[PDB]
Amino acid sequence: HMSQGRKAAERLAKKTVLITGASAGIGKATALEYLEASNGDMKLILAARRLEKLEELKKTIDQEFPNAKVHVAQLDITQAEKIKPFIENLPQEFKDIDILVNNAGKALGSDRVGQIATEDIQDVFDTNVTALINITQAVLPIFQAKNSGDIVNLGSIAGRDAYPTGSIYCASKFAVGAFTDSLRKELINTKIRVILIAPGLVETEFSLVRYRGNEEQAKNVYKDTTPLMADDVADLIVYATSRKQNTVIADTLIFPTNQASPHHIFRG
Amino acid sequence: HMSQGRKAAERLAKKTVLITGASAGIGKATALEYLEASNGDMKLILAARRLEKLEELKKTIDQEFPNAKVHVAQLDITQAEKIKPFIENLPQEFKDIDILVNNAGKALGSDRVGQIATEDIQDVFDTNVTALINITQAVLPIFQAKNSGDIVNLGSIAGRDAYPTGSIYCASKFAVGAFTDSLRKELINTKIRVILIAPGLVETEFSLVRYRGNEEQAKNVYKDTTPLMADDVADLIVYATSRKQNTVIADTLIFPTNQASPHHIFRG
Amino acid sequence: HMSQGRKAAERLAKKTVLITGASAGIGKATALEYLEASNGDMKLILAARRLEKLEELKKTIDQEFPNAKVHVAQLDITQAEKIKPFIENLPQEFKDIDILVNNAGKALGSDRVGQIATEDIQDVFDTNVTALINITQAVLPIFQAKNSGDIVNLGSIAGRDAYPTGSIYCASKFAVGAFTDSLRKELINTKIRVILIAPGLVETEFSLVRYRGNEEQAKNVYKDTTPLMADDVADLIVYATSRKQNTVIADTLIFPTNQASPHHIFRG
Amino acid sequence: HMSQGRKAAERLAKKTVLITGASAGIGKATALEYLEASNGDMKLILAARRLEKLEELKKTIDQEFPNAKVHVAQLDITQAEKIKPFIENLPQEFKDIDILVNNAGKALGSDRVGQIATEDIQDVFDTNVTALINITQAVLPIFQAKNSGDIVNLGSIAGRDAYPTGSIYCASKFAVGAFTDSLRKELINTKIRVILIAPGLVETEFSLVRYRGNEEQAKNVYKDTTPLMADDVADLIVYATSRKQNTVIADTLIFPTNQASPHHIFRG
């Protein structure tokens, strides 16, 4: 198991990764890809709300990667007050986080301004931005203590090119990008790496969530295109975080070949 | 009184402007400037938390511009549940808003990530982003009914060029920009104008608020420079909103001559 | 004649403006607008290739603004070797330039990459970028000697949001923006103002030139929209350059109300 | 020899890469890295002006990668008239290009506007922009005929964040980005991948060229930092081009850990 070559595996070995939104889509793919690239030799902290999904993943990992160690954690990152204790209370074995993947995130609906539910505004901002920042602040001290660690934030093409009907989501991803940029500028005197991942169309549960479980509307987003799959973004994240320390794959835009922006999507 | 020429005064006359953060700084300057440019002939809705400051402004206006009509409103735009009623309950005379100026906003501290108080995060985001969106959604129906109206959003240079120690503020201003951009893209089939104003250094109460009333630290931000004053930004706002309808001064970055970015500030 | 109010007229009076592309469209509008805003009391240096068009304009100005002084100059700004002498040889009366408007510019064709004529590539880059820089370098010493002066560069929405079929033009306008931004950052220790004007659809001779004189294709670009007219952009330029010296209207995107990007253009 | 894992080697095998600026720095590193990742099993066309440097590289490759096939080409990409014939005249074996790496490029001096030699302006633009576009147009038909191929353009952090003293270079890299973006938007209906690589500080011959051979000034750019080495950027290029076809690593900013922008560079 060395999906990315020997040197990348060496660099990943024995590191501890904390992944938010590990129950599905990119987060889940990323947990698996980290093992593919390191010959199973890492420690994973998988956090999301759906505990069974996490358990199921751990079981999959357990048999596929005997030498992997996985700590499953039911956490709604929206519940601010639980973040700091969550970190402080990690089992000894998993306390020394090396890579934080702020992947948990969502979009709710495609309403034009004027039609947007206040709940949808709070939920998207709280999950995408506020929680991302809380989790970041709670982990950072670990990195600063040892002057090492990667902070990986999931932005989006929507974070640099806004589109109509996506005002809130775009506002949230623009925010994530900016926060990420300040952070990188603050840390230039450390060896802590700050990495922004910005995908276009990836077929996950993202569109299913976005349209409240309506499978029709979800599949329709990808109709007549070959979008990215979660493992494609996972591939990039593991790639970025397995570079030699001095290298920062700082900001990457990943697209399916048929897409060039939110407004430029070829449908065959 | 026609600070911007006859034609601009004609275009402004008898319009109703709603201004958030009218008690100080740019919002206050903007109320005054609208009158300077329209020969007093407008209707102003001035909202902020400090009711006395608003009253004082109204009194100033009352004697300076007898023909102006001013409705003062004590409102904390952060109290979401009060927004919709606020708009619906405007006195008949002021109900027909023509220009919305989403000016109320703030920055809290200059802490590097890791050191940022959760209250400061919520306050900045709620005031700068969430409330701006709520207020925008509450007013927009008025504009859509009559297919006219200007939406003016206070962004910042910080909204397109992030800087260390300003992660939250920058994140919030990037969000305001992106929301604004989505909005403009949604409304291209209307005659509703969407305008983003993005200043650099303006000497107001902004730095005083930012450093919790410490006048030392506040004055220090402007030390050895000649920053913009609030009437400079007011000038631009009134300029943008007094153009003929078909013209959209969509996005303007305004700088004092000694500044070229958050990182490029000459001190004499 | 004070289209922009008294204070703006005072600030413009007796200043010397150098305008490239004065024979048509925005450049021509801008010469006229400067006079509207200053009560005719300025000195204009109008440069372009079509000498009769310039003469015609001067004649118009001569009778409309008796107190204006206009120096007409047949110049192909693409002829680098003539730039420095051009400046150095201005008649005494016009030597002390206060405002440079780098307006001359064009786009040639709408060919996709693979189909682009080399002549069209050189012409667009030489006029839009190289000449702009040459002219800028030649005038700048005047401004540095007296520590004042405005440099106005015509960018475009295309300079920040590229679009298919416009690769060369967009590349050129991105370049103009970047050059402009470096410049502003270099001059923060001077009182020299650096101003970028970025329009969307303006109906001038721009599309006519772009499609090699084919009036059909030209009119077609504006079909079913109400684009900006050249005086709209002139209005903005005169506005920016008539602000008090300390204020820099640094970067303004101006759109007709039906447009929000090169990709978002409503046609009624 | 599979620096990036088996699957990536499979995807690279037997492909033909054309590399500009192969005689040194990133271009040279990239030729080497392609072989490291594919077990020597590719065909390289190495072009630059210094023929001996190319020969030397080929000799290195010949003994290190017996199964590699290398065509060396003395070419000044600035000589436009030679581009099309260059492509058309490639030996049969190397005619079917799969990957174009537009790497040749340079910066000349660090002069502020006003002090910039016209030769330096033409040389930078002709090499970085005009030649890049010419070479792109000449190779593209190959890709369109077979509906596959990667176009890799070397941009820079300078292409999205301009800095004083780098106006021309920045202008040139902004143009490369914009051209690149247009190109990707044009090709969404093909399976041709369009990839922008944007590094910060890499220690190559780049600074040596920039300061006309002065080793002092060159080494000084990197003093007290650990910059990226050419093989770091090579790694990213090979990574991007060895993804499965549907995946486009569209736009990647790569930094040494001590850098976060042109203005944010920590020196230890």
Ligand SMILES: NC(=O)c1ccc[n+]([C@@H]2O[C@H](COP(=O)([O-])OP(=O)(O)OC[C@H]3O[C@@H](n4cnc5c(N)ncnc54)[C@H](OP(=O)(O)O)[C@@H]3O)[C@@H](O)[C@H]2O)c1
């Ligand atoms: N997929 C795309 O096309 C797209 C494009 C660009 C960027 N992105 C970004 O990439 C990230 C991952 O998206 P995705 O496509 O993988 O979405 P997804 O398939 O819907 O998964 C999102 C994950 O986040 C978790 N999550 C949501 N809210 C949470 C909360 N309050 N607390 C803890 N965990 C929470 C979910 O698990 P539970 O429900 O079990 O808690 C789920 O596992 C998001 O930030 C998204 O914005 C997505």
Ligand SMILES: NC(=O)c1ccc[n+]([C@@H]2O[C@H](COP(=O)([O-])OP(=O)(O)OC[C@H]3O[C@@H](n4cnc5c(N)ncnc54)[C@H](OP(=O)(O)O)[C@@H]3O)[C@@H](O)[C@H]2O)c1
């Ligand atoms: N100063 C700068 O250099 C700078 C630069 C770029 C952009 N801006 C932006 O310009 C806008 C105005 O800033 P400024 O410099 O004029 O600031 P300021 O002088 O401190 O005034 C801000 C106004 O907002 C009001 N406000 C704050 N929170 C409120 C709330 N929760 N509910 C209702 N009103 C509230 C305040 O009034 P009350 O306390 O009475 O409620 C105050 O009148 C902000 O959006 C700011 O981000 C400032």
Ligand SMILES: NC(=O)c1ccc[n+]([C@@H]2O[C@H](COP(=O)([O-])OP(=O)(O)OC[C@H]3O[C@@H](n4cnc5c(N)ncnc54)[C@H](OP(=O)(O)O)[C@@H]3O)[C@@H](O)[C@H]2O)c1
């Ligand atoms: N119109 C739009 O939709 C649009 C949008 C954004 C930006 N812009 C920009 O705004 C500026 C002016 O546009 P426009 O609409 O006014 O175009 P226009 O109507 O074609 O006029 C351009 C002017 O430049 C002059 N000119 C062209 N090449 C020249 C050369 N080589 N040497 C000297 N003068 C030259 C032309 O005069 P002669 O032929 O007589 O020399 C003409 O006066 C340009 O930078 C353009 O890129 C236009």
Ligand SMILES: NC(=O)c1ccc[n+]([C@@H]2O[C@H](COP(=O)([O-])OP(=O)(O)OC[C@H]3O[C@@H](n4cnc5c(N)ncnc54)[C@H](OP(=O)(O)O)[C@@H]3O)[C@@H](O)[C@H]2O)c1
């Ligand atoms: N180094 C950095 O910090 C950095 C950062 C961002 C982007 N970049 C970009 O990365 C690319 C490579 O730069 P580098 O650091 O590798 O520079 P480098 O070490 O100086 O190499 C540049 C290469 O380009 C070739 N070249 C220059 N002009 C040419 C011409 N007219 N025709 C054919 N070949 C030519 C040179 O070969 P000959 O002299 O033999 O012709 C040399 O092989 C450039 O596009 C650069 O702008 C560099």
